[PDB]
Every structure is written in C-alpha cells, then in structure tokens.
Symmetry: C3
Subunit: 333 residues, 3 copies
C-alpha cells in the first residue's frame, strides 16, 4: 500500500551538480517527491551570440538529474506556467507504461499534473518531453534530462565489490539544429512557434549546427570547470536524448563504464572512449591520479572543438612522475 510508505521531498539543483542523496539506501522504499516547472526561454548557445528558444525542465539545459533507489516510487509534479506558449509532457525511460508517462502528462500552459511510477530497474535513464507530432522538435530544443536509479546497496564493480564515488557530475549533451539563411547564417526568432516553422527542415539534415554540454559552448569551462582532487573518485553521468556521443576524458580513462547506463550489468573496464547511443544515459567512474587541466569531450573532435561538445576539469594535488614525465622538454638541439 503506497499510502503507508514514507514521502520525502527533494529540491533539485542545476546541472552539472546533482542533488544530495545516499548511495546505499538508508531507508526502505519511499515515495520521492520532485517538482519541475517548465520554462520556455531564449538561450544564447555560442560565443557568437546565436539565440534559440529553449524548452526547459526547471530552467536549464539539460534538465536536472533526479536520483532515487531501485523500487522507490518517483512522484513528479510537472508545472507548465501560463507564461509558456506550448503544450508539453514528460517520458521517463526509467518508467513502465503509457509511453514512459508521456500519455498521462500532457499539460497546456496554465496546467499541472502529478505522475507516479515505480523505479523498477537500476541505472541512469533519459527523461524527455515528447508531445505527439512534435517529439524531435521539443527534445532538440533542450527539453530532456536524466534520472539515476541507484541499486539499494549502491554501485558494484565487475567482481561484486563496492564502488563509492566521492563526487558526481551530470553532463547533458545537446544537439541543436539552428536554421540558416541561404548563405549559412543562423536565424533568430521572437517566439518558439516562429522558430518551429524552419525547424523540421533543419532537423532533417541530420547535421547539428551546435553540440553543447550544459546548454552552451564553454559552459563547463573557466569559473564553471568541473573540479576534483588527486585520489578522488568521480562518477560522470552523461546523457544524449537524440543522437550518439562518444565521451572521453583527455588525460584519463573511464575506469568503470556503464556505456548504456544499466547497473545490473558489470561495467566495462579501462575504457578510453565509449559509445552512448542517442536516447541513452551512461555513467563513467574514474579515480583521478594526476593534477592539472583535463578536457572532457565527445571524441568526434569536430563535434567537440568546432561544434561545442567539450568541457574541462581542474584537478588539484600531487603530480606523479612515475605515471608520466617530460624527460627532455621541447627544445631545438
């Protein structure tokens, strides 16, 4: 009887940070209550000032990472304020039935709904908007995020021993299809419905104009670089709701990788690069061994360094010359 279970309210935080949670469940099954408010907003996605109408869950691209344990219930209050202009809904790939919830959560501006589902399968999963006849348009406008369903006993390695992360980050990777004039210039629009009328043609090229982490070129750099210390164990959750990606930590590895995101499977070990299919979340565990700057990319390096799918870590601590050293620094002899 679900009414006899504990209810716990969670306040979500902005990616790439993740709300506070316990890896090992410290209670029995609960009803975990989340509220997300839909926001349509203009977003500047590149250094050039290119502007799109973003369709967001909770004001961000990606939407926030939700975290529960296996056989908890997710209870989502989804709010579509009348300041928005479109009909939206939500499909959880973690959920079973009703198109992942999409059939039950269609909210017009001025409406709200509350969906409950049982998180029966452990892993990281995409969630995304999916309105009939407008699915790729909403998704590729940024209206996607992810949910992590932890095993009740936390994460385990390929031999059944614990893997405990010290830090967790959520990297949402977004393909955008910004329409262009005949010369190749990106268009801007006053409303989402104006933007929509060039969108299907732009999408049908299957060629993104931009591919970004955390909603913009350079978003996970500078004052917003990801951080760690030598010795720290970091889980990087990575989603792509519409298009394949191939994450890579430049100067590191994925020590343990669930490339298709599902924790009942043993992780792949020692990955350089892994394929997260479009429509999937994956997760990589790494223990930092060297200080300094790292880049974290989609390893189609064009997509990374030209189209925006690149962020940075800044890592503190002790350089290990056994692991790597410059024997003779660059010089002319």
């Amino acid at each position: 009887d679900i009414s006899t279970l504990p209810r716990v309210k969670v306040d979500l935080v902005k990616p790439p940070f993740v709300h506070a949670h316990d890896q090992v469940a410290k209670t029995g099954p609960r009803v975990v209550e989340f509220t997300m408010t839909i926001e349509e907003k203009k977003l500047v996605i590149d250094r050039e000032g290119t502007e799109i109408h973003a369709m967001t869950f909770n004001g961000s691209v990606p939407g926030p990472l939700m975290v529960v344990h296996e056989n908890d219930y997710v209870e989502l209050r989804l709010i579509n304020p009348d300041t928005n202009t479109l009909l939206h809904n939500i499909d959880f790939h973690a959920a079973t039935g009703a198109l992942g919830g999409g059939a039950l959560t269609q909210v017009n501006p001025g409406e709200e709904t509350t969906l409950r589902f049982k998180a029966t399968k452990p892993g990281v999963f995409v969630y995304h908007c999916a309105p009939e006849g407008m699915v790729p348009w909403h998704v590729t406008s940024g209206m996607n995020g992810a949910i992590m369903v932890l095993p009740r006993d936390g994460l385990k390695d390929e031999k059944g021993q614990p893997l405990t992360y010290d830090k967790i980050y959520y990297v949402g990777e977004q393909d955008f299809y910004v329409p262009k004039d005949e010369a190749g210039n990106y268009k801007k629009y006053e409303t989402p419905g104006e933007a929509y009328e060039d969108a299907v043609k732009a999408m049908r090229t299957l060629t993104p104009t931009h591919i970004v982490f955390n909603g913009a070129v350079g978003a996970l750099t500078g004052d917003h670089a990801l951080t760690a210390a030598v010795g720290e164990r970091v889980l990087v959750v990575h989603s792509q709701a519409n298009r394949d990606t191939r994450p890579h930590l430049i100067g590191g590895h994925g020590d343990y990788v669930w490339a298709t995101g599902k924790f009942r499977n043993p992780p792949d070990l020692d990955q350089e690069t892994w394929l997260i299919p479009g429509g999937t979340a994956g997760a990589a565990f790494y223990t930092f061994r060297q200080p300094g700057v790292y880049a974290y990319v989609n390893h189609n390096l064009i997509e990374a360094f030209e189209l925006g799918a690149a962020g940075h870590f800044k890592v503190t601590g002790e350089w290990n010359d056994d692991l790597m050293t410059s024997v003779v620094k660059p010089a002319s002899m």
Copy 2:
C-alpha cells in the same frame, strides 16, 4: 555425410512475422531448405507517394527472417526471374567463406542457384545482396534481410537459465537515399537502371532521405501494429544492413538485449536503448507489464518521427497502478 541428414523444407512468411520454428531443437542437425525469389518492383515508401525501385528477396523489404539451429545446414535456392533486369547474389553474415556466399551466387535474370552453408555460430545475422561494384546500391534498395541461428538448447539469460519467447517479430530498418532535384524534390524513375544514375551521388551524402521499418513510413502501425498481451514474452529481432540504429521501446525496455546479435554472449540487462551497428542484427527480449499503445523507434528521434523509423505495439490486458499512475490528471488549478 550431409546426404544422410534429414531435409526439412521451410516456406517463408512476410516480415514482421517469422516462420514457425522450435526454440529448442526437436531433431538432430538438419539440412533446412529455403527458396527465395528475387523481385525488383516499384515501392511507395512514404505518405507523400515517393516511389523507388526496390530490389527484394521474396517481395518484401526487408527480406524474410530465416530460422535454423546451430550446426544445421542452410540450403538456399535463390531464383532471379527473367522479369528482373539486374544481376543479384546473396552474402550471409552467418556463413563462412566465399564472401558469405556472394562469390558463389551471382545470378543473372533467368538464372537460379543453390548455396549450402553450415550455420556454425548462433545469433541473428544480416544477409544482403552484394554484386561487385554495386554493393551499397543493392543494399540501400532494400535487398537485405536476416537469419536467426538459435542455439540447439534455445536462448539463455546472463546466468544460464532459459529465456523462452511467446512471440517473435522481425523489424528490418532500411535507409533509402532518394535522389532530389535542385529544390529538394524526390525523383521517380521508370526502371532500376534509370534510378542508378543518380544513386551514387545521393548515397555519398551519407544522409538518408527516408529511414523506415518493414519497407514504408507507417508500415508497422494501424491494422499492422505489432501486438502482445500483458505477461507475454516478446523477442524483437532488428537489423540494419548499412547504417547504425538505436532501438527503443517507448514505455518499455529491453529486458535482455543482444545488441550485436550473438547468443554465446550474455545479454545486456534492462536496456533503455541499444546500438545496433550498421551491418548487424540485434535481438531484444521484453516481457510486457502494461497494456496500451507503445511506439518502437530508432531513438534518433528525427530519424524516427521525421524520416519514418517508428512503429507501434498494441498491448491488451490489465493496467498496473503500482507500476505507474496519474495521481493528479492534467488540469488548471
């Protein structure tokens, strides 16, 4: 001595249905006799009336699913009637030697051939036409299907216990490269050889104009939706002879997935989405838990909902409110 083995004739059926077979082999090794007749035909592939010259095995795109057991012999009589205009052949990815059979099966219009191979490796496998110098042209004209080579003791899970499907469907996914005029309009042609003269340029864009299940937009919808009941175990075989895909059951999962199709490997569990590389067949097992409409897509949602890679299931039975429920239906308060 192959001449001392039983011979069994199989009459093939039209995808997405699959000929009758036993999961667990009820006889010893056999010679399993199949006949396929090549048919070049005009095919309307979209709602707009776009017409291509399809190059088919047995009149369908995809060709039919053949089913045998490990260490059976496949004996295929391949017929190229003189009503056709091109030279064709067949390459089985299940087979060993002679370019999968392609080197031994070149048939002009008016010719037939009979190939035998031993199905030494269990899994689902692509088969496709592959005439020297015209390989992608034939494949991307629809001239591909798949063969399932079951283990003699049936399918097994990640721990060695039986997996028994109640229903099986074969989803062939086809990328087409329909040539366009300068404005973007799709061309039509009177013969395959006329179509060929714009084909290499269209293909070289690496950008399909259409991506369809069972040979057309909407083919696996309406009166041709796939069906199941709550509680039924369904195996969905999925092939793509030329281009990567990423299948996803909207509102379900792949409970057990062989994403690259080979049953000696333990399946991946609880997948949301999986990558079937171009040139591969994969297979997903799911037990339905909720009634209603599902969509089954390539989860590049542009490819799905704009280019045609989407079908439906209609599932009968009992809604499970523990698994999912609308707590507050969409409303304005």
Copy 3:
C-alpha cells in the same frame, strides 16, 4: 627506480605491419624506447588523384603501431624537423596526465622532445596529435595511430584460456574532409596553411569526402592485400581517432572482439560487425577456415565501397565444402 630498469630500443615499421614483440612478456618491466619523426607531406588519397597535406607520425597514415606490455614505460622521442611548417604534439589515450602527454610535447619545427609514461592499462589505444585550437584539423589530416599495451601474460578468452595470434595487422581508418568548390570539385593546395583556411568549414559538415584504410583508397588491396592461411589465427587492430566505424570481415567473423579495445574485459564472441567509437582502438581475433579473397570493410557500405573504407585479405589453403558449397552453380534451367 626507473633508472634501474632495462631499456630496449624499438624500431617501428610501416602499417599495416606491426613491429616484432612477444605476446607473453619474456622480461620484467622495461623502458621501451620509440622514436617518431613528424612528416608533413602531400598524399594522393584516391584513384582520381585527390591530394591533401598529410600530417604524419613517421611518414605514414596511420602512424605506426607501438607495442609494449602492461606496466612497461613508454619513452617516446618525438622529432619535428624544420622541414615541417606547423607546431605538433602527441596525446596517448593509453597515458595518464597532462592531456595524455599533449601538454608536455608541443614541438615547433626544428624541435624535439622526449615523453615517458607508464602503460598502466592493457588494451589497444589511439594516439593522436592535439595542438590547442587545431585538434580536429591535425587529427583529420592523418596525424593519429595506435599503441597496444598487452597484458604481461598475453591475451585470454572469455573463460581465461590463452588466445595466441599467429599474425597481427593494424588497420588505421581515416576520415578526410577535402574542401570543394561550388560544383563539388576537390581543391588542392601548395602548403598545409593554405589548406587550413577551407578546413574548418569542410569539417563542420560532419560528412567525410573520403574514408580510407592505410591512407588511400585501395591501399590494402592488390600487391598490398593482407594475407593469411587457413588455420592461422589473426589479430586485426583497428583504430578511428575521430569518427565511429563498424568493421566487418566479409566471409568471416570476429571470433573474439574487444570492440572498445580493453583487454581486462572478456571479448564479445562470434561478432559479424562491431562498433568502434570515434576516439577508440578495437581488436578482433579470427581463425581463418576458408581460402580465397575476403574483403574487410567499414559496414556502412557507402563508406566502404564509395568513400574508400575497404581492404582485402588473400588466404591460402584448403576449401571446406562442409562449411560452404555451391550445390547448383548459377544457371538458367
């Protein structure tokens, strides 16, 4: 103390051949000394005479395969002669820290450097040039190769028994983005810096003009086909530094495949086709069972047969009619 370890000098050889090595380490950990000299050169990449400025490690596309054992030290002397025009560096995906070495190895024309790293993780790994702000440009100009880090006890199967190859080949697969005039004709240039000024636009299409093995259309055919004998065990290492590929041996299989290249994981069995993500090396083991010609392709067959990602094996020995036979040769009846 690294100074107390043996030093062994290796002279590299031209792909697809691989320098001599021991599968099972016959010494303790060593410092393995490699020298590579950077060469910018014009390269003809197709039958039509299309010419690019290749940026090479050691004169070849791909660069040579380096081979060491787990917990050896790689010590690379990287030489950038003043006959070159650009600044280059090297990132080892096998290495830990300093952007895989890229931060420590920036060499102007006329300079050299020596990097040492510990090969702590077994597998095949990409290495590539990666100069800040010019990364995809160098990589897609051919400036990438691979390194194999063998387990000290050699390769093992999915059950822990030895896998010993008789032959090894290295297939580097290169995506090129040759700029075109308005009609679609490929441009030529007198220097790399001239070529660079059309390069970012060509790359941003995400549509290669050419996709080749061993640096040119047809490079692994004719007098340069790969060779084997029936019964021989062959390891094919395959890398793609920038873009996904899907290798396939036409008329064979990958009996044991590490599709993402890392030997601590059990191989996938009996693969028809596998996905090597861009930014990765993979490795497939096969025992030949049939003589004759094979093709080895990227199984996007357009990429293979139109854009150049196809090579051949010529295999000697005994045809096995149990495995495959023509029962009735093509004929009209």
